[PDB]
Design a protein around this motif. Structure first.
Motif, PDB file in Angstrom:
ATOM      1  N   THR A 171      -1.667  -5.210 -11.191  1.00 66.39           N
ATOM      2  CA  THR A 171      -0.339  -4.462 -11.098  1.00 66.39           C
ATOM      3  C   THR A 171       0.763  -5.414 -10.575  1.00 66.39           C
ATOM      4  O   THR A 171       0.615  -5.994  -9.490  1.00 66.39           O
ATOM      5  N   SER A 206      -3.729  -0.823 -10.122  1.00 64.33           N
ATOM      6  CA  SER A 206      -4.858  -1.231 -10.940  1.00 64.33           C
ATOM      7  C   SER A 206      -6.126  -1.509 -10.145  1.00 64.33           C
ATOM      8  O   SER A 206      -6.098  -2.234  -9.163  1.00 64.33           O
ATOM      9  N   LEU A 207      -7.255  -0.932 -10.580  1.00 66.22           N
ATOM     10  CA  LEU A 207      -8.574  -1.356 -10.064  1.00 66.22           C
ATOM     11  C   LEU A 207      -9.314  -2.275 -11.020  1.00 66.22           C
ATOM     12  O   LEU A 207     -10.491  -2.465 -10.865  1.00 66.22           O
ATOM     13  N   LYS A 261       0.850  -1.187   0.000  1.00 71.98           N
ATOM     14  CA  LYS A 261       0.000   0.000   0.000  1.00 71.98           C
ATOM     15  C   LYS A 261       0.887   1.239   0.000  1.00 71.98           C
ATOM     16  O   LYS A 261       0.644   2.176  -0.767  1.00 71.98           O
ATOM     17  N   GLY A 278      -6.648  -2.681  -4.468  1.00 72.36           N
ATOM     18  CA  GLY A 278      -6.173  -2.945  -5.808  1.00 72.36           C
ATOM     19  C   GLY A 278      -6.000  -4.422  -6.147  1.00 72.36           C
ATOM     20  O   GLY A 278      -6.180  -5.297  -5.320  1.00 72.36           O
ATOM     21  N   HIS A 321       2.531   1.458  -3.662  1.00 74.52           N
ATOM     22  CA  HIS A 321       1.638   1.447  -4.824  1.00 74.52           C
ATOM     23  C   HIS A 321       0.362   2.237  -4.488  1.00 74.52           C
ATOM     24  O   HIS A 321      -0.699   1.658  -4.235  1.00 74.52           O
ATOM     25  N   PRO A 322       0.487   3.563  -4.420  1.00 72.88           N
ATOM     26  CA  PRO A 322      -0.683   4.334  -4.040  1.00 72.88           C
ATOM     27  C   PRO A 322      -1.772   4.327  -5.097  1.00 72.88           C
ATOM     28  O   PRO A 322      -2.945   4.431  -4.723  1.00 72.88           O
ATOM     29  N   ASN A 323      -1.418   4.190  -6.379  1.00 71.97           N
ATOM     30  CA  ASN A 323      -2.438   4.135  -7.437  1.00 71.97           C
ATOM     31  C   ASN A 323      -2.402   2.832  -8.248  1.00 71.97           C
ATOM     32  O   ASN A 323      -1.976   2.786  -9.408  1.00 71.97           O
TER      33      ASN A 323
END
Lengths: 161, 174, 159, 166, 158, 157
Positions: E37, E30-31, E23, E147, E26-28
């Motif tokens: 990701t 894949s959703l 976390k 994610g 990888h703040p952004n």
């Protein structure tokens, strides 16, 4: 929660140092022939191993050992070559404090006959960290006869709690 | 038995995965007095062998164990040996524990001139000033050290500051 | 059907050589660059950057690199003091054992102070052992002197 | 600027003789395998955690030093020579290998040969890595105890280790 | 004439994911579950039980599993707090590179509800496998998608 | 200069090879006050990464090195995540060495889990004993196999 008892006994730990005599011969062609002044070798030239027990751990294989044990535990050190002293023979003759606290009592040599073997025995008497230096003689064999190559020592590391 | 124990001089190299840092820390501190924390997972630490010296060779945490008396000399570089991105150490300090090591001193090293042609394969391409951070172990016990470094990127035959970062490693002396 | 977007990686490999160890253990080495002295993998450390599907024994002289078919590698070498005193300089990489996993290595020069890297691509699957030859110089009075020419053997595999 | 020819850098590759020592924690085996086989054609399986394996260094040779599984990587052409002992170097209990055979995978090694080495009598089990590939080997050994200086057979055991050659 | 009684072994493998490391790094992510990701193998640990002819680098996220053709595997995933807080839940395993050592994996449901991903080494060789998982954060006695991720690990059969 | 050194919260997971234990220790204690000793060889310990924290990741002994002030939270499970046989920690206490950690507290996390939490409050090295219950999955019921403890090592600076 205050009623859980744990059997806690003194352990008896076997340690074996396995020495790469060919490597040593190659990298130390003109070693000391004086057993009172042994030639320092790096810990990369050998391997140390020990049996497991509760509260005991180590970097198994590493010539440094990095042993951690319990106050009260007994240790017994033996050394041999990669061909189990069948050709060249690596024969420990002393173990002594090199750095740090006097964790271990002075080591005692013990003989075991049948082939003669020798182990170097001690007890973890105090908490702390200690570096030990172990000296060995390295012999080669030619006309089925042993001959001295040199006297060497390496340093390894132990700790007790 | 005479072992002739003497103070060793241990060289230590920190090798930093600058590509990993840049991906995982895209907006780092640009204030060198306030460096960005990185995990020890982002780098590797190596040290030369000596009697009574051991470590977790490769791990960014090092786990160095050595003798009171031993000197240490620390340098840092990238996985491409500071040929592109450069990771340059500017400070070392105590983070936790006993002051096993003396405070560190930055020392400048000038690289030697080249060897004669007779001594140099043509196959080799070969000015740099280097800095090393020297100390000595002076008390028994366990210490964690923070090492802070500047990460520069290579833009076009020119360096630009990406950020200031630090990691923590661990050492002990007996 | 899930899309992982596998593509070629570009892996940086750094060999860090214990030159003080070598000098002590090989006091009269080869001075012939066509015939370098073998050194054991205990005398150096190899490191690589992480990437999807790439693994290694980090810090080991043997490396035990496991990567994907298609991956690029770029190898450089230096001493524990980063070539600031003694210097270790790679001059050749070649197959020693095994399959021809890697294309022939090619030297690349990298400008400002001057560096060199040895690059290749894993074009076939299998296991390959590679021999890397290097020159070791000592430094005396702000001048370099050849100490000797050496090689080590490391292990790589591609899938 | 001395000319070095990149196509005649000669490494003088030669077959290596690798010495391998298996060090068996016999105290652990006795506690954890209290009812072993007493039939040597059907030895009892022990986990590779019961033991350590060590090998000498050589170019192109690598292993997980210490691990009972070894994970040996060597060159086609190299010869291995395997011996076995306890943590106390067979001075009390003794662990003595009597056979090494293929357990899984390719036939990297030729069938092993027992060789005697003399001037205590010592035996090693030797084979040449003849083909590239990966093989798992089973090594069977007899464990003899000494209690009150009386030697007797405790059981026959085997562990499996791994090797690969290129 | 030594009989080893060689049998197919059933190996249990546990992937323990350092969800806090992920976390923060990888703040952004894949959703979309079809495009997970990639994370480095340094972000988790893999463990397996011992068996004859089975070895691994115990604890490493890449595993380095070496087993026998005919051995079965069962993979499960969990976080450092055993999915009691953040949760890491595997949803797919597939071939990334190499030989088809393992058959396609089967999701098996166990009963309080768990899921294991099982297969068998059907072929000799070396394979890299990609395992995709959903990382959920625990908010206030509630779980939300953070994610979708995958890691790659390595295995060989002989 | 400013590193803003923060106290860390370290999650530790012990993963127990229940099949290995069953084979190795077929007649264990059925008395929870008197658990049966096992080798750290039968399990694995892992912890999260943080600055100043290291361990021998995977080893049942852990060899954890952390900072004074850091919190630990320990949980245990089987290689099948307690989905069949179950390994459930019920106690943690000092075994050897310095009292580096405060007494451990059980905390319930709500399908129901339990963790065992402490803080490193002094510098030094401590060995800890952790006791757990091993249950086997009869059909869809649990039966007690035995009570066990292992010994692991930690140090704070």
């Amino acid at each position: 929660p205050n009623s859980i008892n744990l059997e806690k006994a003194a352990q008896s730990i076997q340690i074996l140092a396995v020495i790469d005599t060919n490597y040593i011969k190659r990298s130390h062609p003109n070693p000391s022939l004086n057993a009172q002044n042994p030639t320092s070798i790096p810990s990369t030239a050998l391997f140390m191993l020990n049996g497991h027990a509760p509260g005991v751990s180590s970097s198994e294989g590493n010539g440094n050992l990095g042993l951690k044990l319990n106050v009260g535990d007994k240790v017994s050190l033996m050394g041999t070559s990669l061909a189990d002293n069948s050709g060249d023979a690596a024969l420990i003759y002393h173990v002594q404090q090199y750095s740090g606290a006097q964790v271990f009592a002075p080591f005692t040599a013990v003989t075991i006959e049948q082939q003669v073997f020798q182990a170097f025995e001690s007890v973890a008497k105090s908490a702390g960290s200690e570096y030990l230096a172990t000296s060995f003689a390295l012999y080669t064999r030619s006309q089925n006869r042993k001959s001295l190559f040199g006297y060497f020592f390496w340093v390894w590391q132990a700790a007790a709690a």
